[model samples]
Target: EKNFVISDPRLPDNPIIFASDSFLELTEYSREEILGRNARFLQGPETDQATVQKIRDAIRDQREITVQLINYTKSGKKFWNLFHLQPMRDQKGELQYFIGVQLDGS
Candidate 1:
């Protein structure tokens, strides 16, 4: 199971519509807690504001972005998060959803 979440920016608060099992394992969050929540829930005190700014810019611009940063699990364990955010578009090039892929912390 690959860590991934499919989120709908069109929806209120840009909640995740789908979360992979691997993501659940990585974050130690139940599917019930993950769904319909913004990805920012993984952020913690040490998460870089600069990285977050980059992510915000990418999302607002609807572009693909890759960044490595710190993230927290349900137990508040910090991990190195290597992730990518890509905008999924429709046939007509309209923004549909965003797919976030994460690499297991090593």
Candidate 2:
């Protein structure tokens, strides 16, 4: 299964409205633990701040971006996150959500 999350930036954590089963498997987080937190929850101390900054900028600009990020699992295992982000808009050009799709650590 593909890994993905539908991000709601309006929420306090920009919570995930949807997360694929594969996302759960890869992140080693229960759906309950994941749904209401920002995607950055996966980030650990060693995760690149510069990469995070780039992601923030891309989201601010409402553009698509691809970056590799480092993330830690619930079990404290580190993995590479090959991230792909796309801004989703509505008919009136109103920003609705962001879709973050990804590949595995390998």
Candidate 3:
């Protein structure tokens, strides 16, 4: 897998690259544990099927989407996350990687 570089300035601590302190606090996974893993690591058997399906469909269609999804931490704690996904394009306007912003609530 290609290494993803985090360029968003909104993250003052450069959380997306080194480690998202907030993310680790919520998910209970160390930076080393999740660095190369997909965010789906937060999902599990109890996650909503409809929500997952919607996200999958949106990704397949290359659409910008936002959804509220139920996700779990490494220790099996569940929470609701507002997930925002934006599909990015290269200089040639070809779709490249998908950028996701997740806000944890409750």
Candidate 4:
């Protein structure tokens, strides 16, 4: 199974609230350390600014987006990250959270 993390946009900084155990396995981040942190932490020198802007635009427009970018692990290892960003809406169509599903493109 792939990894996924859920972030609360309503919260200041849109910090991660929940992350699958699989994500921990992939990134080597402890649950305590990863929580309340933005996914931008995964970005590193090799990451492209344009890809980040696309993610920002997708979130700003409250839409779904798919992108492949470079991400770093806790040990500073770089990997090709193919991810999908989805906006979660409740029954009332109220924006709830955002789900980021990550795949190792490598």
Candidate 5:
């Protein structure tokens, strides 16, 4: 199935939380650049404040949240994305990582 994925080769060291092919085409970023960095890298000064805060709160509390947000591409183009994030636990019953899912902007 087709999915949204994008990355920056420069960000290979970063953890890739989520990605899809559509995302890559929209952001103009390869998979490597975004792997280790938070998706927020796409946000700019003009990005939505309320949405940003909501995402921040969700990550801070390690809670799952679904939000509509604006993101910037490597070429400075902007796009909308519906983001969903959830925390995952390891076999030992410890929090392991966060998994994020995204859809095209509304």
Candidate 6:
């Protein structure tokens, strides 16, 4: 799965408007469940709080960053998720979405 996600970048908990079929397979979450939800759903207790904050800060600043995280699967399995996140602004310079490229770096 060339895992990636496209999402609205609003201040609130922006819903995941669209997800790749490969992402559904990789995360073991159905399309319905994946929709209208934040990626935090994939996190559990083992997820690093510091890293989460780090990514959040970067995204909020409209800065692209590559970070590695301990992400969990539907079955509670953990893997190293290496990813890069960037803004997907519209042609008129309106910030609309953020594109995330994710992979199991483990």
Candidate No. with top lDDT: 4
Each model's C-alpha lDDT?
A: 0.93, 0.89, 0.68, 0.95, 0.68, 0.83
Off by over 4 Å in 3: 1-19
Off by over 4 Å in 5: 1-14, 17-22
Q: Per-residue alpha-carbon lDDT of model 6 for 1-106, expressed as tens digits?
A: 3788878867468678888988877788888887777887878888899989988898778879888888888888898889788888889998889888789877
For candidate 4, what is the TM-score?
0.97
Candidate 5's clash total is: 21
Candidate 1 lDDT, 63-89, residue by residue in tens: 999999899999999998988999999
Clashing pairs in 6: none
Instruction: List candidate 6 segments past 4 Å from native.
Output: none
Score every model by TM-score: 0.96, 0.93, 0.74, 0.97, 0.74, 0.92
Candidate 2, residue 18: the lDDT equals: 93
Q: Indicate which candidate wins on TM-score.
A: 4
RMSD per model, one decimal = 1.1, 1.2, 7.5, 0.8, 4.5, 1.5
**Model 4 residue 33 distance off true place after TM-score fit, in angstroms:** 0.6
lDDT for model 5, on a 0 to 1 scale? Answer: 0.68
Which of candidates 3 and 6 reaches a greater lDDT? Answer: 6
Clashing pairs in 4: none
lDDT of 4 by residue, 1-106 (tens): 4699999999998899999999999999999999999999999999999999999999999999999999999999999999899999999999999999999989
lDDT of 1 at 93: 91
Q: How many pairs in model 1 have backbone atoms within 3 A of each other, for residues 3 or more apart or on separate chains, i.e. clashes?
A: 0
Which residue window of length 10 is worst by lDDT in model 5? 5-14
Residue-level lDDT of model 2, residues 1-106, one tens digit each, is 3999999877765788899998999889999987877888889988999999999999999999999988888998988888999999989999899999978766
Clashing pairs in 3: none
Question: Which candidate, 3 or 5, has the higher lDDT?
Answer: 5
